[PDB]
Amino acid sequence: GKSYPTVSADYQKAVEKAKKKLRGFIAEKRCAPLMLKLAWHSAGTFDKGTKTGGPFGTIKHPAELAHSANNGLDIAVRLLEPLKAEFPILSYADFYQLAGVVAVEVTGGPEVPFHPGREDKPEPPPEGRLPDATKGSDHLRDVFGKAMGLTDQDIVALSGGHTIGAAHKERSGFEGPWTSNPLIFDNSYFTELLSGEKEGLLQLPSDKALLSDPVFRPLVDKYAADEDAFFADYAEAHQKLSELGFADA
Amino acid sequence: GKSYPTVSADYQKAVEKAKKKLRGFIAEKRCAPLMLKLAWHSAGTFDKGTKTGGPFGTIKHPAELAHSANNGLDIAVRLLEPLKAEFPILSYADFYQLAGVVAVEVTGGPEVPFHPGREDKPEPPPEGRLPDATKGSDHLRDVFGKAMGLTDQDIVALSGGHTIGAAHKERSGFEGPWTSNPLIFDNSYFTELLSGEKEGLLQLPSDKALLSDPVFRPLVDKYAADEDAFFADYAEAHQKLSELGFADA
Ligand code: HEM
Ligand code: HEM
């Protein structure tokens, strides 16, 4: 149900050139997970009923950066600012979603389709829309389903984003990577989730909540068994996430 | 542009009986200003663009009561609870707006028309929509105009609500009454505003902002000169305020 806006040939050229620059920068700086988090925290605030929040560049606002969920994202914003300044024609909205897409690609994940044209909006959403790591399945459906408008399948596939990166006791309070290979986009998140606790690896209560749900569980199993199927469903869910409220939501 | 809902004859009877009980209670307890504040803080959170907030009973929620603007309104809620329990058929939305209307009447103000039928909504608006006492005319238009959808005239007339009651250093930090007669609804707020500072009387920066604005000032002058005109415009503005998002906003 999307109708994507026309952007100029110059705009498209800058997308292509920014995409390449983002690859080099993110790979060199080893900051793919942080950039994926930046894109997800930008998009994940969308509320379908009121058409507020979502991926519209507001994550750069000091006010949204002050949200406790967004601990450490000021680093992400700061890291990208010099690069963004090379592409003044692009919206921050687009640039940050493009960073997220590139973060997934340079760690070896699926190629998430990208459509330009998000406008930078003046008002950040209110604080408190991002999911709570201590809650379970009901909460996840409230946030991803009732607010964002994504599916149960999208919830499980997107949770797989934890295949890269780590928690930090100074940010959330949780600590350590979900996987043994936290700069590699693979289905290891689901394998580790299933096998139970292992020394040095993290599971949030929100990850554990996927195991006990009658709908989430079969998807955890599917993705653990079949990384191709994970990649397919992940690319679908990330695209929808990155486009919430955009070109029709 | 309002279309008021049908309510049962039993509902209407309870409105009439609650109105009378509210008169006696508010007069005896000397709590008209607090009740007017309770009604205004309930209604004043309406945002026209998203149709969120407004007079829908959510002021009783511990979460909205925790808003710093709402210091001392937990007392107001507590005071009315026994009375409300005598009228289980009425929405809190209606009961609190009716308290506001009665607060104005029992202190000798205009008779603000009242239409029943507000539904109690599950979600409080986000914090931060109520006006800031330290700001001026631009802010007042942002809040009353851009968010609530009221007029410049409504801003000045409603500011006249400060004709009753007082600030408290333990609540806002401001202190004392606007008028020499703070349980009497009259045009004294505008008279005192115009004559400048007087010992024992309060003026907020937001009240003072009415004096310097080219549109607000002539209305301050009109109301100071003519309490009948104040009463007419006040009754209009309060009615619109009490009905924001209700029966069409
Ligand atoms: C399902 C609900 C989710 C919860 C409760 C949640 C919660 C968290 C928490 C608590 C952290 C640790 C932050 C820190 O301490 O540094 C984190 C990190 C992370 N999240 Fe999630 N998140 C969720 C969904 C997602 C989604 C949908 C994605 C992307 C598709 C994602 C991607 C990431 C990444 C890449 C990191 C690592 C950041 C880094 O390495 O600095 N998360 N998340
Ligand atoms: C114009 C912007 C407004 C600002 C900045 C503002 C601000 C304030 C502040 C700071 C207080 C003192 C709270 C305390 O310390 O106890 C107060 C009290 C009060 N306000 Fe306003 N207010 C505004 C508009 C209104 C409106 C529209 C009404 C109703 C029509 C209203 C009715 C009242 C009443 C009756 C009190 C006294 C409460 C008491 O006696 O405990 N105000 N307001």
TrEMBL record, chains A, B:
Pfam families per the UniProt record, alphabetical: peroxidase (PF00141)
Biased composition (Basic and acidic residues): 116-136
Cofactor(s) needed for function: heme b
Record: residues binding L-ascorbate: K29, L34, R171
Signal peptide segment: none
Start and end residues of each Plant heme peroxidase family profile domain: 73-249
CDD domains: ascorbate_peroxidase
Family as reported in the entry's similarity comment: Belongs to the peroxidase family. Ascorbate peroxidase subfamily.
Xref: InterPro entries: Ccp1-like (IPR044831), Haem_peroxidase (IPR002016), Haem_peroxidase_sf (IPR010255), Peroxidase_I (IPR002207), Peroxidases_AS (IPR019794), Peroxidases_heam-ligand_BS (IPR019793)
Biological classification of the source: Eukaryota, Viridiplantae, Streptophyta, Embryophyta, Tracheophyta
Binding, heme b 1: H162, A166, H168, S172
Full protein name: L-ascorbate peroxidase
Domain of life of the native organism: Eukaryota
One GO BP annotation of this record: cellular response to oxidative stress
Positions of Fe(3+) binding: H162
EC supergroup of this enzyme: oxidoreductase
Keyword Flavoprotein listed: no
SUPFAM superfamilies named among the record's database cross-references: Heme-dependent peroxidases (SSF48113)
GO MF annotation list: heme binding; L-ascorbate peroxidase activity; metal ion binding
